[model samples]
Target: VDGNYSVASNVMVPMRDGVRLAVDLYRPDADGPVPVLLVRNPYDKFDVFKWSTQSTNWLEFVRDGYAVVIQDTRGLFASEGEFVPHVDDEADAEDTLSWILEQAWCDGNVGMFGKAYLGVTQWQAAVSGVGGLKAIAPSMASADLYRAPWYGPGGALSVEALLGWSALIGRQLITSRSDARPEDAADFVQLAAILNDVAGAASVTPLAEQPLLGRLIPWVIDQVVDHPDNDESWQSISLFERLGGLATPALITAGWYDGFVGESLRTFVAVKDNADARLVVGPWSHSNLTGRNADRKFGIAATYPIQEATTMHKAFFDRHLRGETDALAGVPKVRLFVMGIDEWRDETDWPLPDTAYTPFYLGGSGAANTSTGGGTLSTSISGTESADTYLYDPADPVPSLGGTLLFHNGDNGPADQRPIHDRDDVLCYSTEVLTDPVEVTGTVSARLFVSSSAVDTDFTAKLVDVFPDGRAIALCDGIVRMRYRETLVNPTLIEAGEIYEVAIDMLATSNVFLPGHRIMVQVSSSNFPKYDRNSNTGGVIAREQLEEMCTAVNRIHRGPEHPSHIVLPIIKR
Candidate 1:
């Protein structure tokens, strides 16, 4: 509407099913034909106040001699069809791209970019092999729906994040409808009540009867009641399973504490050899990408490269769609910000090929029940056998402290673990005050020889950095549902007294343990709300769960016979 761009609002784009989607077009005033930039998202496209502050504003693309199209996904504002997340995105996006190429003001080239759910739309379209699509940039979004922010590695549901998200988006859907008259006031009030106390609403019993969520946002209810395992339902929309044939070049970005960081890296690794891709990870949470975390802060250098994102995306488009020769000549293939050292580093690949897969054996005197107890970690495996035992009561599960989490009641990034470590239910193991610096910069894992009194339970592990002053900061952590120990697809409940070796994938991280800082590992059974609390009964979750709660005594064995240790991908610089 300003400068060299002209605006066209509420342009209906028809899909194959005849459902028209709401779109806004921003085109150069003097353009004969120009490349198109498409941003497809469920969020409102006309939120000018928010769009103006973002790095990917439509006006910026229009000013750069390109037409920018922003569209609300199917079943959202001004769009037709029932609203369901990830179900119709691929078809709708492909249809939109086809329509754009046929328009008078468009050349046969298109690029896509956005953040969060907007970013995921790009992935869905790219996987569809849409015509005229040249490049994409997806930031802070997961390629897999069952992992990362949605579902934990151990089959625990991300209760708070998912329920809160459903309420937020569901409220938007309600406010956007125009057909509803004054008679719909009751419906509006009910929706508002759930949005006001989302956490409380999520904790409601029968989970299926939670205000307007069950009737209006049935997808959230479906996610809770079904698909706890990676089944056909989950695999249908998983970009991880469908990435093998994705040909579009991508510029992926993620924050170290962002909920989707693991999936972001997983996507990059999956397509790195087959497609031209680049990655940049910053020290940030899901929302904050500017160095400051919940407990610590990295200086100005830790800030996200807003300018770099714009420039790189432009260059990617220029080279692929516009035939520019040297548009992306100097961009790094991989870049990561190390937390403890508070510095950035450029690498040729992830998990640097030279990394040492070092194992730190767990050692204790059977009294490693709390931070005050004796628990040690060393490279040498002691011949003396010992085991630590604790009682895990689902009624009073350990509260989530910090690490990768969505915008919820819990904090994000490296927060002190002193309060968590103080609990008798949590087992804390630490190495002696580090005499030298240890740089761990990749995937972390732990093997625990565990046994529980209940038929099925959960085992959680967290990698931490302990400062000399006694502040323990969580780096990354994970949980493994006992039944889903071997594979998520086929879960087999364990024998009550049988000792089984279980592997807990602690996800990934990039941090250095500086001199005087000790490497610590925490073994616990629950990190409530971040991941749903596991009822020892192992009955159905998210449906009649409160009454299923039970107490279970769990044991972690250590020594040569039943060695329990954590494996760190230590990068020796």
Candidate 2:
């Protein structure tokens, strides 16, 4: 039988509430029933079939004897209902799946695959425990919306990425509604105007009132202001809380420089015990998977050997949906791309059992405020107390250079951090030239004892692999909002001069510090638009403006008593 496929466009998929979703179905030309592979996204279902990007393509499923369905979520494109992000996706996806199973073309066995927002929908549908949903492959998606792409670990808003994403999708929403209402057509015009001046819009006073996002998507602004803490609103969409109940097998993919890499690993770890879950992390960023980045390329091997994204998904689906046991024969439970050395490796499990949690204490001559300063990272502990202090002016924040950023301004993945390290506000501590290779894999964290001159502020940490020829490439970084240093859900303002111990989760990464390369850590107060600046006035972080800005003299204390250090998960060969 010839395996040609036929595409049916603009099919109205009726949900449980009578609100219809627009889906494009690509079924095999054969007459018999076929398994379904679905991708639900708000980014125009038509575009999914038009081009093949670095990520998964739906047409491959059609070629492999499966029906591929792409649908527009509620209130986006041709779909009916008001557009609310992630809120109604669970119920809507369940209804969509129910509709699919009832179709004569669908064979009851179904699988889902997509990246970013599309991948998120897959997780939402899978967690609903919907019948016939057998497997999912979610790439660069977060199960915990609050802890990642939306906001940093400590409640700081991910300003540039989120606002930029809103602008991108906001245009689509306006474009989709333009035909129905002439008034909405003007929104499409205004969206372009805003995007044209995004940098200016991002720097607008009183972030909540920023015209770029506010004029087009006020609901997103409201969500940001109202839900700074992990409240019921965010919890309702979060998959982390619901992962315990997930029984579906998942093939998770992430990038070392992807914003959701840590969360992806966490999701894999959560379901690995209950179900067959596997994870693959590459050396790319939020968007790239070919191992090529802005500053460096990880050679050809850095890319997934299978090349096309659809091929990987097809392999996983073959085993789960088609019951082909040998489909993923040689694949390991965890496949990670080790940077610096730039090689891919496989492991039986995460946090390899032979891993060593090594600590590198922060030491210096109390002037580790810049790359030129005498800052050192060593296993040796100093007997005398010493402190490094820097003025953190909210007016002059440390701009985001690289490491785990989203698709905006074309700045994501590992880039040379020389420019960032040159800033006086960023405290740089580094190890001496390595005599042997040091492969750091798994979770990365920093422990610091500090005091601030303001009631509230932020502390940031970045892990960099310093080359002998002087290239500082960021692997992973994290931030800690002073108010939420102890807990993400609660706020506790800092005393003006009291010392406190804070631990910053630098997320996770797999990297190898090659021989002669140095391990460096940069500590600072902000990563600019990567995270909202702490107002120092103890006011709302994202909503506050220049009026609330204050200069905070932050200190990093190190000694036998204060022993500020970073913990790296070293996998010794």
Candidate 3:
């Protein structure tokens, strides 16, 4: 370490729009200019309990010859201007980077760091292809508003991710404003009453009618009402779509069980053509790095300080920003934790090149509605199979359990699926105990041949790991809105009782099934509150009224021509 550092709090930085955003600068007491690491935050910059303080030390960066800056974005916390979520992030980041370059304590080189919203800021800034930025470490975040913490894969809005998060930070909207209206105060109070019961808040019938969100984030209301499908509105916030513009070297991090890990993988893929792009993933949820989650204890190997995050991220920043070529000379391009084995492995590319993209065909008799039914998964097609049928009622949809979630509606990580196994609506298909370890390490998706009595509905798929003791732990899952099956930008209603194939993206996962364990796939029509329930009326889902909602008879076709199966990226040993 070279020297000590000092904190400069509440430093106002002006945006091109002339609004002054607040930032806290940590500069080393050195003789010459130093590399600057900037963090743009939507949350409070002064809060020590925030995400930035968790695994990394700012003073360490300062001590190691770098200037650190953490700032509040426009109209959030101590910042100015009307806050509009992600709309202003890119412009503000560009402005902030330019200002940092002109300052006396700064070097022309810049790097960005943070997680979640903070990570998003780094991406938006890096996406600008700005000159000062040389590197970024954006962990557990997606640059697209179409992806949650906003909307989900199938156009279903995640009630908890969007509303629950907004409620958690709703007070800041009032605190950040001096000319607070009576309605603003009242809206925040209402937002507070439901804060503790975020799950209950999801049951609100008109999902887009929250006045508090309307006041603070009116765009949420607009997107739900006007752009329920992906459109130009969503395209603006999609840095995933703008990956071509990103040239900065980045170190991407994510969790096997996080909501945004899918996008993290996508990011690494888009940037890894260069020699410097990197990725690291662990078996963690949105707020956990503990070894034990749900019904499984992945051992000390999965626990916190899993990687020396501070050391890992520091080296990543140093290599790109300071141009220390040897800082990461021995590091591999990708690091992922294999869940069943509970150990970290180093690799060069995603979807590992030798992966066997095998289809796990859902084979069973027609009565595959519950675990007790004759539902089975076969590697090859079986002529002795029939279609499975189930009824989906929005009023009594399947409760969310385990897997990736923001508010955790119920359980997070690999929770036991047995709790929801008995529901007649949840169709279960499982393979026999594996004689050898079956390692699946990449993208997971389902192709379902199906139809509904109603014109439109939703379909879901879950990949699970089943133990010898009859325990079923969900690994990852996904959903597809019937209308958006063809393309998200424009939706076409399905013809009633006419079978058509629909694809559901279960995202990606890295897990291994031990010798005695079984592999299972769950098919269902709803995962309530994890995603908003489809009204089944072919009407706009978000704005649909309770009266317009109705139960629909849904079916999953099986056997030869209409094989409903999940594609597992199986790695051969």
Candidate 4:
């Protein structure tokens, strides 16, 4: 559209099934053919290439002598066929890339880049072994749908994202007149005609009308109903096992607050076995990639602009894709943003090599951290400590806040824990103030050796960076139900009062605790709206009754036998 690049809108690319997919192409006005940058998206392809600022637009790529092609996935806007997430990427992507390769204005070489849903499609399509694809850059996406999908740890459904997404963008695919008009809907019907043509089955009725929605909506609804376990049903859609198959050079990026951070890091690790993959994690959320949300946790240090992260991403692609010899070439394999210090640092690997495994034992100051008792967290697991006990009522369960939900309720806007710290239900333990600044970078885990009064109970652990001024910032957190702690694949009811070891992985983080700051761990039964409250009845969530539950006497053993402790990645530098 601009003088810098030539734009071609609404190009048709046919898939293997003869369903034509809609695509938008942006190419440089160069004399010779250029490498193609392809992006396949399920979320409206028309909205592709809308950069934060026009200055940093997709035209920049075209201006730099690269052809950019953005395509809507089949069954989405302007595309024909059913829209199944992560389905047929191998065949569809390979065919699409091959078609682009054959174009006269395009070179054989191809690269891919995007964030969130767009990001995952790049990998999914690339992994199908597309002929011209050379490299890809994926940001804020997960490799496996199972571990990080609608339902996460402790039988908690990511309802905010799961339902909110379906209600908003997802439902429109079938209902919207723009896409559902006779002309457009005709192509869609013909695309999946064979499946819809089946006569007898009433369940297939929805498919005959809204084939894509008929299939996917039920899948989403089923996810809402069944708390998916780590089983074959989940493994069928898992991309973790296929990671070793991804040989393309990948540049992985994610935010500390991104729900897909764990998946992104794990994807990098999986690709490490075969490809030259690198990582960069900043202190932002799923939407904002900069350090904007960093202040919520690290105070002043977290107040940087979003441009910084975008610059880093551009530089990274420049070096790897454009063959530019830049300083990014020497950038550490793992580039991370440390919270308390609110600074960026480079390391050879995710958990810095110098990271020492520090264990902080939990102890109480004779009172529960909840409102009933003056609950206090202590480093001392001293003589004859009694097990802290509290009742977790599911009916009056804690409400979801802003931490990890799909929607932001604004309650989690600030990192204030004083109100929550005063709750008797929450167990807080803090270590002595550090004599010097302590840098931690890696996975933080909580090992709880206790028994649940019910067949199941949710265990939530939050790693907090406590400043000398009484500011407590949440670092990273993890949750696991008593039943699934041992194995998510097969959840067995925990015998009441039966002592068992439940290891809760508190995600991973990079933070610098100041000289006077203390490293603290808050153990609780729930995190409200961030995750659905565990009813503790061992019953399903959607159709379960809200019932009050008795308090469980949970014990934390730090001795050589049980030796329950919070394992942290302590960087020696």
Candidate 5:
């Protein structure tokens, strides 16, 4: 014990079920013990565990007197057991934390950190009540996968992202550490079969070419066709109700442009109610924690300040695990990036305690134009006599643009939306110029009363911060397929010409519309690629041909029977 610390590489821990999990440990290359930093993940855990040391300029926490441990969760690369999303925390994480605490290098204080899947794992492990698991920084991670909308609002399947994730993860499970072992591939096939069977849909491609980029794509078409309701499967996996059990310190990170912004806010608010937690939101996208991608949408300011995130994360963990006095003292519990202003602001709480709930009521003539047809944001439908109607053809669906789609990977960025706004299928509503700066920094919700001419369709609401000159940058947005409006786990077709009331969670945002700027809401029927195109046939989806199209008249109502409005979190200093 009086010599240089021995580095244990690729140590396997056998669980109670005899499944072995692979982990790597990096103790200080010195003689003494150190605080343990544990990161459990399905994604490449090794890459992150060794990150601090791998970077030339950055000081390695392990080398600077700490013990870093990274382990692959069950059924992931280098880990054993059947893979079930969000199901490994109870056993795998608890056991791993126990093992880390027993290590001589560990000083009985353990901290966890990661983003996305890894982030959730941190929370999951902490929830197990495992001793020595002290703090966690779960960034861009959802407490519940089902509620996270892998498919997005209205249960519209996120074909690209979901399929891409499944393919990537499924492939890793299949190919990790063995060509002779066929369990991962078999398990994946079985899982796929169940999902497809429930979807009553065909496999996206042949099983042999599994893990194909487009082959294993989510059989979203099947989801659209077969089960269109909040059924058993959808309810079982939702994790919102379990927040009361989360007693550990959490540092939640999210982005205004991320699909899980709602969950991020929900997580923050939930923990703040019972435990200690903080939130940091940037004007970035889903993968905001990682800095590999540059800001192509807004400006340099739109990108994350990695230095700030790193500093904050380090301080949080150091204080929680090392007992550094007042390490987080005076640090704003909520740090939000204001989009239009390209500035950063700190607040005591989210939805900022001082913020006003501004209701922008929908009032306009039957015409749904960007300029002349619409009415004031302050008046309700009581004044507007007519309802707005437009044709929505499922075949020629409203194509998606920058707001939520994966557009910046060697593709177009902010300037990409120019052609998108020009399309006739999208209905853009704008408010007059604001006389003063209005800082809207939290959740945005849309309540719409509508009547549809088709059995199944979609309603998309986008909150945008329009610049004085012309930039209509998207702040947050949400969508609801008509059939699944009542509930995602259940699907009930809409009666033609019947009015329905629907509320869409337009996610969350932190933006300030400067004086002379405008606030705009764009409503449309489809956002392709980001979601599967609604066949609109009103029948089972598989029976309908890909080219087949259904046309319906969509009306946005604003009368006694239909009060449409958007609720904004306005902060007036």
Candidate 6:
């Protein structure tokens, strides 16, 4: 259908309340009425396709006899409400769905699509159970704002990613305002200076005292200062817990290296009982979906070719919104790209059902402080082994190399961790070079019996695939702050020198350890800017002074009694 389309830009879309949200509406010139594809994004609606078309094309949707509604989220662009990040999306999305169904151009059918916060809007609309929502394609996003994006599963604030997001939103919000504030120029000055050194900006102590974020994006104060844990405030906005309200057919998309992949999988599990719900994950990051990133290429088969990607979504919408069941042909319940082998495969369910959750025990002679250290990971239990200890200096934290990170400086995705393995602070445990292929395609986690000299600290874990050439490619990683070790909702500081068990959620991935490659686990105390540094004093971590920071002598226990191990969801071939 090569339909010609007429664009109605800056259309004031009225919500239930009087405030009008701005939208760029596209409708086929010859169409009597058509199903709508709505995208509500905080990013400017005018230039959304320029950046988001890589995932799916709105122009193509319009050309194929569908009305495309690109809306600026409330308070961000031309929209007429106060932008509060995760706070207003649900109500606003409910309002937009109503407006679309009422439009003469819309045939009372609508599908929502977008990535990141745009995807968040889709989830919100689905949660609201709005009548007009037929299907939603939510890509590279999380339903839980507090646990997924702003904060980590380990309970530490995602300082680097949040700063990047807040800074970008700040630029857009400041410029979108008509009334000039005295601090606008000064804020930009500081913003630009901080952008030049984002890693430097993350260094400021007592994140609540950070110069620009709270001033520009006031919601950061609520996320960073007021509700650091999974308190009722965050729980109110968390969609993961509100899954009971969602029942819409969903085409869920995610990236293997996406920061929110864990929640993406979790959300899929929650909704996959519905026959129409589907999941597709590729070897891409938050923005890059080229099948290749910083360190390696996964081949064209890993790429979601533009034509194929569009067809996939077209088929989904065609089946759900257009009632063309034939369009569902060739669509699988799950489509995933497997790295290392560089192959794509279809699956009926997540976690594979037959997955073997195997644990590889950690053992060493207390020298597992570097890549060359004598650390071993094996299925056999070690009778006894010396505990490994390292000085976790908050001043000199372990740098964030790669694996599921979102930042503008462009160091995200898989990267060689050889340089990082040189640091004595990072504990490296490895299995002997594999003679057989081992594939891990589900969730990953690490369980550790640990002790710290300081009142409270952190423990980080990474799963790396080491090549014969000594290249350590970090696949997935995670961290756990001592105070939140038990749970994300509440905190209990550890007694100094008391050994306690902790579990670190290392995210998930689909990667094969081929012959001649070795499986390795790297343990450390910090991932630097990826997560906020622990002051080690257990005194308001997000608001502590640098001078109050302490060097923690942390220990990783090993052996039968206090065995520390990584649980890998090994795919049984």
Which numbered prediction scores highest in lDDT against the true structure? Answer: 6
What 10-residue stretch in candidate 3 is worst by lDDT?
A: 48-57
Candidate 2 displacement at residue 338 in angstroms: 1.0
Instruction: Assess candidate 2 and give its lDDT.
Output: 0.82
Rank candidates, lDDT, best first: 6, 3, 2, 1, 5, 4
> Model 6, 1-573: lDDT tens per residue?
357888989999877778899999888886478999998878898886555655775577888898888898887778887888778888888988888888888888899888888787788888887777899988888888876778879998888788877887787777867897888887877877776777788888767786578877777776656677789888888888676456778888888888788888878888877537888888887766667666677887776666777888999999989999799887888888888888888998887878899999998665898999989898777678569989999899998877776774444477788878788889999999999999988999999999999989999999998988877888988999989998888898899989899999988989999999999999999997878899999888777788878999999999999889999999967
Residue 218's lDDT within candidate 6 is 74
Model 1 misplacement above 4 A:
1-3, 48-58, 179-201
Sorted by TM-score, highest first, which candidate order results?
6, 3, 2, 1, 4, 5
Residues 208-286, model 2: lDDT tens digits: 7766466566767777655888877788888887888888899898888887788888888888888889888887676
TM-score of each: 0.94, 0.95, 0.96, 0.84, 0.84, 0.96
lDDT against the true structure, per candidate, is: 0.81, 0.82, 0.83, 0.65, 0.65, 0.84
User: To one decimal, what is the Cα RMSD in angstroms of model 1 from the true structure?
Assistant: 2.3
Error of 2 at 82 (Å): 1.5
Per-residue lDDT for 241 in model 5? Answer: 66
Q: Candidate 5 lDDT, tens digit per residue, 19-107?
A: 89989776767655678877776765666643332112112455456677878777767676766666556678888888888877778
Model 2 regions more than 4 Å off: 49-51, 177-199, 304-308
Candidate 1 residue-wise lDDT, 1-573, digit = tens: 335878899999999999999999988887378999898878788875653333444466678888889998998887888889898998999999999999998889998888778778888888877769988888877788788677866677777678767767766777777877564577777766755654566566555555566666788767655668878888788778778777778878887777887888888888788878888888777766667765677888887766766777787788877879788888788889988888888888876778898889999675888898888888899678988999998777887777786745443577788887789989989898988889999888899999999988999999999988878888889899998999988888899989999999888899999999999999999887677777788677556567666899999989899889999998887
How does residue 121 of candidate 3 score in lDDT? 83
Q: Give the TM-score of candidate 5.
A: 0.84
Q: Which residue pairs overlap in candidate 2's backbone?
A: none
**Candidate 4 C-alpha lDDT tens digits along 1-573:** 324677888799998789888899888877767788888877666664453231135556677677888888877777888766666665778889989989998867788877776677776766677666877878777767655646665555554555345534444564444635555555345434322321111112111233443354665545433545767766665667877876887878876767777777878888876866888787756644334443364444453333544565456556656667773755678878776777877778765667787776665456555533533343444444456666666544444333444443422422546657666667777767788887778877777777677777887888887777787777778787776776778887888887788788776788888899877777777776556556676665444434333344444443445555687878866
In angstroms, give how far residue 455 of model 4 lies from its true place. 0.9
